[PDB]
Amino acid sequence: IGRIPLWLVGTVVGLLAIGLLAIFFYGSYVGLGSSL
Amino acid sequence: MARPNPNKQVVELNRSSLYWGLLLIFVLAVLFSSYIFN
Amino acid sequence: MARPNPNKQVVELNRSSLYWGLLLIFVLAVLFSSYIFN
Amino acid sequence: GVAGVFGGSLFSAMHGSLVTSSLIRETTENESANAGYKFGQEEETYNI
Amino acid sequence: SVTPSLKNFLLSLVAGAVVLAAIAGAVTAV
Amino acid sequence: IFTVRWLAIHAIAVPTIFFLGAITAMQFIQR
Amino acid sequence: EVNILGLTATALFIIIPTSFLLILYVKTAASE
Amino acid sequence: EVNILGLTATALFIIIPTSFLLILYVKTAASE
Amino acid sequence: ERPFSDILTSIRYWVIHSITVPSLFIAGWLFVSTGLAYDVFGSPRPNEYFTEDRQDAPLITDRFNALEQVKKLSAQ
Amino acid sequence: MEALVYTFLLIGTLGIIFFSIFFREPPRIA
Amino acid sequence: MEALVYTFLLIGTLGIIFFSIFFREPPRIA
Amino acid sequence: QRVRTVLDMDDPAKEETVKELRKDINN
Amino acid sequence: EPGIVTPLGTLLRPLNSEAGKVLPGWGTTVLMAVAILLFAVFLLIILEIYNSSLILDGVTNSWESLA
Amino acid sequence: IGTYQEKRTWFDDADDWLRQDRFVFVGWSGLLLLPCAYFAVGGWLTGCTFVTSWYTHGLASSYIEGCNFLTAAVSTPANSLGHSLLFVWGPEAQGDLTRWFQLGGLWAFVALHGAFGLIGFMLRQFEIARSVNLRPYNAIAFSAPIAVFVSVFLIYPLGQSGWFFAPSFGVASIFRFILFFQGFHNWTLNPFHMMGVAGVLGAALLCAIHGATVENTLFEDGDGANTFRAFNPTQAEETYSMVTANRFWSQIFGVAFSNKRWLHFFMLFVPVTGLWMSALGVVGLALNLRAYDFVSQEIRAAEDPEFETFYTKNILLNEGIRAWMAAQDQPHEKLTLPEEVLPRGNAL
Amino acid sequence: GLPWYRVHTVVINDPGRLISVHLMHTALVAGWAGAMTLFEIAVFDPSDPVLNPMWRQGMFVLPFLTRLGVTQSWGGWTISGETSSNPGIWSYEGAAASHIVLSGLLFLASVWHWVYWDLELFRDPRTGKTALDLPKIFGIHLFLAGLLCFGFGAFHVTGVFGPGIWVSDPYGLTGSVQPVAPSWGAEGFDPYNPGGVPAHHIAAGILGVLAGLFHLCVRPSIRLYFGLSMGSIESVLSSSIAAVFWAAFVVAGTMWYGSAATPIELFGPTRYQWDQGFFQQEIQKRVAQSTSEGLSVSEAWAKIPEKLAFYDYIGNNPAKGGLFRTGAMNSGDGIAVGWLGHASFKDQEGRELFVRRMPTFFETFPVVLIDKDGVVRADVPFRKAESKYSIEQVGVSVTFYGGELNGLTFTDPSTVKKYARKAQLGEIFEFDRSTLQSDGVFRSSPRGWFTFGHLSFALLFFFGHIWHGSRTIFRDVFAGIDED
Numbered sequence A: 001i002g003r004i005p006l007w008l009v010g011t012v013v014g015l016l017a018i019g020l021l022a023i024f025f026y027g028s029y030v031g032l033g034s035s036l
Numbered sequence B, C: 001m002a003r004p005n006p007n008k009q010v011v012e013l014n015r016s017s018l019y020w021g022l023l024l025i026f027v028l029a030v031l032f033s034s035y036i037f038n
Numbered sequence D: 001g002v003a004g005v006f007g008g009s010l011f012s013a014m015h016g017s018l019v020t021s022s023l024i025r026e027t028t029e030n031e032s033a034n035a036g037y038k039f040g041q042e043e044e045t046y047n048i
Numbered sequence E: 001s002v003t004p005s006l007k008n009f010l011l012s013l014v015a016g017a018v019v020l021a022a023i024a025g026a027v028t029a030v
Numbered sequence F: 001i002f003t004v005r006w007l008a009i010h011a012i013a014v015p016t017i018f019f020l021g022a023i024t025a026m027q028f029i030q031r
Numbered sequence G, H: 001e002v003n004i005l006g007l008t009a010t011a012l013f014i015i016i017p018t019s020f021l022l023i024l025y026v027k028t029a030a031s032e
Numbered sequence I: 001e002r003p004f005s006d007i008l009t010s011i012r013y014w015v016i017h018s019i020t021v022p023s024l025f026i027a028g029w030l031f032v033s034t035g036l037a038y039d040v041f042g043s044p045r046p047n048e049y050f051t052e053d054r055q056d057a058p059l060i061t062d063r064f065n066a067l068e069q070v071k072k073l074s075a076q
Numbered sequence J, K: 001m002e003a004l005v006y007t008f009l010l011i012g013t014l015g016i017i018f019f020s021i022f023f024r025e026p027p028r029i030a
Numbered sequence L: 001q002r003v004r005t006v007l008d009m010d011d012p013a014k015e016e017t018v019k020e021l022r023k024d025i026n027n
Numbered sequence M: 001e002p003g004i005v006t007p008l009g010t011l012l013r014p015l016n017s018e019a020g021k022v023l024p025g026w027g028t029t030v031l032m033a034v035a036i037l038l039f040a041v042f043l044l045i046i047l048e049i050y051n052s053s054l055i056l057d058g059v060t061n062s063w064e065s066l067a
Numbered sequence N: 001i002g003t004y005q006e007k008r009t010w011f012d013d014a015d016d017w018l019r020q021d022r023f024v025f026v027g028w029s030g031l032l033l034l035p036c037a038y039f040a041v042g043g044w045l046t047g048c049t050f051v052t053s054w055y056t057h058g059l060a061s062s063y064i065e066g067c068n069f070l071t072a073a074v075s076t077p078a079n080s081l082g083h084s085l086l087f088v089w090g091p092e093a094q095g096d097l098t099r100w101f102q103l104g105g106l107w108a109f110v111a112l113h114g115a116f117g118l119i120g121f122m123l124r125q126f127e128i129a130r131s132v133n134l135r136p137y138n139a140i141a142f143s144a145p146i147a148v149f150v151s152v153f154l155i156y157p158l159g160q161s162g163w164f165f166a167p168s169f170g171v172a173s174i175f176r177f178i179l180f181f182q183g184f185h186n187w188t189l190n191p192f193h194m195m196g197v198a199g200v201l202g203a204a205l206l207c208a209i210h211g212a213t214v215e216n217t218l219f220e221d222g223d224g225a226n227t228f229r230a231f232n233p234t235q236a237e238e239t240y241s242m243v244t245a246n247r248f249w250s251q252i253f254g255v256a257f258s259n260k261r262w263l264h265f266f267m268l269f270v271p272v273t274g275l276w277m278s279a280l281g282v283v284g285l286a287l288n289l290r291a292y293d294f295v296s297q298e299i300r301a302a303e304d305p306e307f308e309t310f311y312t313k314n315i316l317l318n319e320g321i322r323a324w325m326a327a328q329d330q331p332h333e334k335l336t337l338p339e340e341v342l343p344r345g346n347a348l
Numbered sequence O: 001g002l003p004w005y006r007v008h009t010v011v012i013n014d015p016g017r018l019i020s021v022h023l024m025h026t027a028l029v030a031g032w033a034g035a036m037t038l039f040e041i042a043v044f045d046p047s048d049p050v051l052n053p054m055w056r057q058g059m060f061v062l063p064f065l066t067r068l069g070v071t072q073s074w075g076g077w078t079i080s081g082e083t084s085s086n087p088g089i090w091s092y093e094g095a096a097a098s099h100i101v102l103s104g105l106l107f108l109a110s111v112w113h114w115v116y117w118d119l120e121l122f123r124d125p126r127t128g129k130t131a132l133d134l135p136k137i138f139g140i141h142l143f144l145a146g147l148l149c150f151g152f153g154a155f156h157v158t159g160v161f162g163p164g165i166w167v168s169d170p171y172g173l174t175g176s177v178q179p180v181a182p183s184w185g186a187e188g189f190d191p192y193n194p195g196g197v198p199a200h201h202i203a204a205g206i207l208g209v210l211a212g213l214f215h216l217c218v219r220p221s222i223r224l225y226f227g228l229s230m231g232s233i234e235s236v237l238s239s240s241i242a243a244v245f246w247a248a249f250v251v252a253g254t255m256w257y258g259s260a261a262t263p264i265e266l267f268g269p270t271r272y273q274w275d276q277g278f279f280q281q282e283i284q285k286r287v288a289q290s291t292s293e294g295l296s297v298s299e300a301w302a303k304i305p306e307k308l309a310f311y312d313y314i315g316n317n318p319a320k321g322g323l324f325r326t327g328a329m330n331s332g333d334g335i336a337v338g339w340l341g342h343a344s345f346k347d348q349e350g351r352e353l354f355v356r357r358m359p360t361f362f363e364t365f366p367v368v369l370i371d372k373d374g375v376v377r378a379d380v381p382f383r384k385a386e387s388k389y390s391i392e393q394v395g396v397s398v399t400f401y402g403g404e405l406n407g408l409t410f411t412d413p414s415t416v417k418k419y420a421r422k423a424q425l426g427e428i429f430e431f432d433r434s435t436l437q438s439d440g441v442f443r444s445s446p447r448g449w450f451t452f453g454h455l456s457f458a459l460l461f462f463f464g465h466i467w468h469g470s471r472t473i474f475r476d477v478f479a480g481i482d483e484d
């Protein structure tokens, strides 16, 4: 209980979510679904 | 002479005049349907 | 339970309901006249 | 915008249902359930 | 005769029976 | 715990994470 | 091929007066 | 010319529900 | 009651979730990278869309012989 | 419908006269 | 006859709107 | 009579025909 | 207060003489559930027959069936 | 029940376990809602991810091949497969899951399970409303979207030649379905669709206007300027001045609501009515009954090359949509129509 | 007072007045049935039952009449191509006037029950309050329903005492009202088998009688009684609405999908028959069979009947109308007066081209003449300025082999384009459009109108059932809870 911050946990989850969104958007310009 | 109308009257249609009017309408109907259909 | 019906009720339609009914009927006629006349 | 108009209809139906269900009995299947008290009191109706 | 569609339908109703049996056991548990 | 909340949260969480991994993997395939 | 003009004429000349007299009779019987 | 069927349909769809709503209104206001 | 606000702060959650969640991420990696998704769900790879016999989109034209037609015109 | 409308009108007349005979208002004032 | 039908229904609905706006029942209970 | 002709001559007029759709694996 | 006494009314009176007269326990709930299950299986059978998805030897599900 | 002994059976224990205050309510209808909705969302998410459409439609509808969330979808089966329910044990699949997915049986799976999940969930609104004892107007309200689901995903493909004309579960798939009804059915012109549009737009209108009116009549109720904390769930007074609101809209719009029972019933009424009328419209379109032609307009435009309307432009544009889209949209039709029979404008 | 949507709730607790409104409705629907039958007899033209069938004339209740046995009327005609036999009292107009007399009798009975409503039959003996024993009432009506189903299945449809069913040819050529023997096997559940209906009715009536016996002798359970509120009339209202829209869904589904209970000679072809090339493959295989042995073209096609070519025409299709494309299909694109024949198209060097037909979804489809294999060889061009597919340079010629037009081949003028456009719809027919001031757009079949109305009503009654189920389950919160 309270050993690592809840706000910091939310920050780490947010960094992973933004990273996944960035990876998904990056995959649209390269490879399959890149029209090239 | 005031806001409500003292000349207001209610309508009365008894059953005898009802039956007479209905008979009148349907007798006019049987008389003129054959002629409008022509 | 007697000679008159105990379940007799009166009907109430205020001016708002009158307006809503007339609006519904007239807008329905407005919409569907172009299709009925075609 | 499509999500918002569909959600606006959804939230309209939802709010309407949740607060027309939350009715303390002042309007019965007659015009109103005034037998408890007639019009003219601050005793508020409904529930939230 | 016993058409493959009918045989598969019989196995299908048996499978549905055991699926609802497992669901009943699960809702009986927990 | 293995209560109804445990079962519901895990039934939602496990395949979402599994498929998120699968899609992140599919982000790097070239024709 | 069905004379709809005469049909609607007969239908209206029945319906409008019988309904009107029924309204008047109902208000006479209700309000004595 | 003139679509008499459509004219009749539109005319009755006006008058009959309109007369219905008006008659309940005037009978409701007659006996409040 | 665990209203979900305490478990994230607790390190005991992340003791076992630093293995299960990356294990599922790696499981998805091997699942699609080993072609198992293609093999299980019938997904065709990018180099097996137009075979030598037909150069256009595959056409269906059947109801009852559907499985025999997929054995005819699948990705070999 | 040629004969049917005259049939409706004749039946209406018969029903009206039947109701006027039987479902009439009772004769009051002498 | 087509055009006057549309004109009449439109101006009639506008008339009902006008009548409901200015000659409504005065509001009660709040 | 001639089974291959009658399907093939229903083919240009209407391709959704039962005669064309049944037993299309052999074609 | 008393209703109008009627000959056909007192004829058919026993058929309305047991309003609410109800058996306790669960009754035949198991039997009606079994009947509903058999009825649902029969309905699924006729559905899959009428879907051309339960092929039988004699049923063709086509206009040729009445040929 | 009703002052009886009511000797406890397995039904009583099962009902007592099903009606408990949990993280998510289960109830008796949870026997249907939870598994059916689970397979519905799982099938849609898997078919958007792995299950392809290179068999059925001959196009890409999966995450594995280059389709985004806006592009991938659970595609419908093919017209040649008819209205078959496509069971795993059905004659099409014959118990092969790998080729069941490829023939599009997952679409029928998701559609049937989504229907039964809808049944279970709105049954659950009955179960909750009975558990805590108020009217199920939530169920009467949600009766309209399930009618929409029935009319769109079941009644229309049942009336058509097969599930191929059903809406595939997706984003661009529903977009294609919308454009299909535009080109082939003239679905904008149908009055039932017009009443559906009116109902939903009026419902969004009512939601926005009611929320804003309540929020701008919220009284003082405190000294902090954050008015949300100025509300107290304990207090029995109204959070908003409905008198002030009524006189405001009486002087702005002319007519205003005077009874909040009528207000909230009307904002319940408009979307349900609109969805029900549009559902009846889709029921009409299921049998290819469409509001397509205005016979006076085509007759007068035929005898006079000078008369035209935006309606006439829309009809000709519908012919364009049909001609240029059905060629690949309906692969079973073998539409190898050349370009000189496909119609054009000048320079385009 | 009472809201306008509530005026009928005054008789929820008055069984006598419930009888009154039920009998009033029965009178109204009986009068409507009689009026519609006489109206459709007045509009009906039996001059050409071969080429101008009643389902092409917007006929709705006469096909339900003919399906069950009545085939002739009082005027001296029969729709089966024969002259009238002895008509008796049970003709079309006889049934209409009989339903009118029923309407009057039911009207007078409704008035009687309205006036006399407090019968002791409606009063409970133990408590003295007005009550109805709904499980016993249901047992009674289940016994009568089983008896009526058994009588209709063992006496009418079997032909031992009734006439049978209007059965037909598989392609809608030869059909009449005849008895059919029941089938107890799998073919008994064959939907297109006419023999399944008598076995269906016999088994269903027997089962209904036995179930009525259990409902008469056995009482319900307390748990079930407080479960679905059997002691209330709103529960039986909701359940009855549920059952009737279930039946409406069944009827609409069978009407669209075709059945032995849906004769093609009374209701027209099917959209699935058109899309699946049913009459087309029939006509073509008959021609191929006649060509294979003996007779050649231009006389073998004359062996093709007048009915089948009319059936193979999308203007007869139920899936081509509109909501407001109103009236008979004859009023749409004229009355059919004759069959031209099969338009045969040849190229300049000589090879048979085929016209691509117009599917149900398309209001307008391109007219293309495609090769024997399935290659595009000619088309009516939009640009008319490019390629080698325009008719005047490809050189196609239209031949015909049928009734009115058999051996005059056209190659030069726009007549070949006109006949390609006409045959692109199916078989080419002459229609007269001046008799009914016919317009040209495609009207809807009576099947389509039936199925549209009953699907919409079934879904609306789904709303009615779910609402009355809500009201019945939740009668405590709809009426009042009084601060608890």
Ligand code: CLA
Pocket (backbone or CB within 6 Å): O026, O029, O030, O033, O034, O037, O061, O062, O064, O065, O067, O068, O095, O096, O099, O142, O145, O146, O149, O204, O205, O207, O208, O209, O247
């Ligand atoms: C003296 C009794 C009588 C007789 C002999 C007839 C005879 C006829 N009627 Mg009629 N009718 C009657 C009474 C009668 N009617 C009454 C009292 C009413 C008022 C409700 C009607 C209202 C009526 C209408 C609206 C119509 C007819 C029509 C017809 C004609 C064709 C019927 C048909 O083939 O459709 C087929 C009949 C059916 C498909 C009924 C099926 C019954 C369903 C399946 C019951 C399902 C629920 C059931 C209780 C379940 C049982 C469960 C089991 C286990 C027991 C036919 C000549 C039709 C016509 O041609 O117009 C004149 C038509 O339009 N009638």
Ligand code: CLA
Pocket (backbone or CB within 6 Å): C028, C029, C030, C032, C033, C036, H009, H010, H011, H013, O039, O040, O043, O057, O058, O059, O060, O323, O324, O325, O326, O327, O328, O445, O446, O449, O450, O451, O453, O454
């Ligand atoms: C569900 C029952 C049913 C069915 C399937 C049919 C089917 C049919 N009827 Mg019919 N009819 C019925 C009930 C039914 N009818 C009833 C109860 C009546 C008494 C009023 C009539 C009276 C009647 C007449 C007089 C005629 C027909 C005719 C026909 C045939 C032509 C198509 C048509 O109906 O026009 C088109 C159908 C529509 C345009 C449907 C309207 C779409 C919806 C309902 C509009 C919604 C209402 C809307 C608010 C109205 C606003 C409009 C307003 C502005 C005027 C057709 C096969 C014609 C015929 O062929 O004669 C034999 C004919 O002349 N019917």
Ligand code: CLA
Pocket (backbone or CB within 6 Å): O004, O005, O006, O007, O008, O009, O237, O241, O460, O461, O462, O463, O464, O465, O467, O471
């Ligand atoms: C045979 C089926 C049936 C029966 C017996 C009832 C009976 C009843 N309903 Mg109900 N209902 C039904 C089906 C049925 N309903 C369906 C299908 C729907 C979905 C549309 C509803 C939706 C519904 C609602 C929302 C409500 C009721 C209500 C009521 C109660 C009083 C309303 C009333 O009748 O006053 C008179 C009705 C009118 C004056 C309606 C006006 C006439 C309409 C607009 C046009 C009529 C056209 C023509 C004459 C007939 C065409 C219909 C026919 C072809 C089917 C009453 C006991 C009320 C209730 O629940 O009580 C609390 C209520 O508010 N019903």
Ligand SMILES: CC(C)=CCC/C(C)=C/CC/C(C)=C/CC/C(C)=C/CC/C(C)=C/CC/C(C)=C/CC/C(C)=C/CC/C(C)=C/CC/C(C)=C/CC1=CC(=O)C(C)=C(C)C1=O
Pocket (backbone or CB within 6 Å): C027, C028, C030, C031, K010, N194, N195, N196, N198, N199, N202, N203, N205, N206, N209, N210, N211, N213, N214, N242, N245, N246, N249, N253, N255, N256, N257, N258, N263, N269, N270, N273, N274, N277
């Ligand atoms: C020459 C000329 C005139 C040319 C015009 C030609 C022309 C284009 C004509 C138009 C044709 C025509 C009418 C087309 C429309 C046809 C159409 C689709 C009709 C729909 C018909 C129909 C039956 C639809 C069914 C669906 C349905 C029920 C929709 C109803 C929609 C509807 C009425 C919505 C409500 C609208 C609205 C203004 C909401 C009220 C909001 C408001 C005033 C709140 C006030 C308020 C808010 C509070 O929060 C509080 C607290 C208080 C107190 C309070 O007061």
Ligand SMILES: CCCCCCCCCCCCCCCC(=O)OC[C@H](COP(=O)(O)OC[C@@H](O)CO)OC(=O)CCCCCCCCCCCCCCC
Pocket (backbone or CB within 6 Å): C014, C016, C017, C019, C020, C023, C027, K010, K013, K014, K017, K020, K021, K027, K028, N252, N253, N254, N255, N256, N257, N258, N259, N262
């Ligand atoms: C310069 C000012 C600008 C505004 C002028 C234009 C405003 C138009 C007035 C709104 C319409 C009035 C509706 C009457 C119906 C009416 O007044 O009902 C009456 C109702 C008031 O009900 P109450 O609150 O009195 O109900 C409680 C009672 O039971 C107790 O007394 O009004 C409303 O529900 C709120 C207004 C909704 C307005 C609905 C919008 C209707 C759209 C009309 C579209 C017409 C078709 C196109 C035109 C051809």
Ligand SMILES: CC1=C(/C=C/C(C)=C/C=C/C(C)=C/C=C/C=C(C)/C=C/C=C(C)/C=C/C2=C(C)CCCC2(C)C)C(C)(C)CCC1
Pocket (backbone or CB within 6 Å): J008, J011, J015, O028, O029, O030, O031, O032, O033, O035, O100, O101, O103, O104, O105, O107, O108
């Ligand atoms: C008294 C009497 C009698 C009889 C009489 C009569 C003759 C009656 C009748 C009657 C009738 C003759 C009836 C009919 C009717 C009709 C109806 C009943 C109808 C209707 C309607 C509806 C329901 C509609 C609806 C709708 C609309 C609105 C439009 C279109 C669409 C729809 C469908 C939605 C006699 C002497 C014999 C004997 C005994 C006594």
Ligand SMILES: CC1=C(/C=C/C(C)=C\C=C/C(C)=C/C=C/C=C(C)/C=C/C=C(C)/C=C/C2=C(C)CCCC2(C)C)C(C)(C)CCC1
Pocket (backbone or CB within 6 Å): A017, A018, A021, A024, F012, F015, F016, F019, F020, F023, N038, N039, N040, N041, N042, N043, N044, N045, N046, N047, N106, N109
């Ligand atoms: C198919 C099928 C099945 C079933 C299954 C299931 C039931 C499951 C599942 C599942 C699931 C359930 C899945 C999932 C997925 C998900 C995902 C893939 C996600 C996502 C993505 C994204 C992109 C996101 C974003 C976001 C948002 C928007 C929200 C929040 C924030 C974030 C950022 C996270 C089986 C095999 C049995 C058999 C039959 C068929």
Ligand SMILES: CC1=C(/C=C/C(C)=C\C=C\C(C)=C\C=C\C=C(C)\C=C\C=C(C)\C=C\C2=C(C)CCCC2(C)C)C(C)(C)CCC1
Pocket (backbone or CB within 6 Å): A007, A010, A011, A012, A013, A014, A015, A018
């Ligand atoms: C909890 C939360 C969340 C999450 C969030 C996040 C994710 C956050 C973050 C964030 C971050 C993560 C941030 C960062 C930052 C940083 C910054 C902003 C900085 C800076 C600075 C500068 C300006 C720079 C400069 C420079 C240059 C220019 C280059 C190189 C060198 C140097 C470094 C000097 C969510 C939404 C889910 C929910 C709600 C809340």
Ligand SMILES: [Fe+2]
Pocket (backbone or CB within 6 Å): D019, N214
């Ligand atoms: Fe509110």
Ligand code: NA
Pocket (backbone or CB within 6 Å): N344, N345, N346, N347, N348
């Ligand atoms: Na252009």
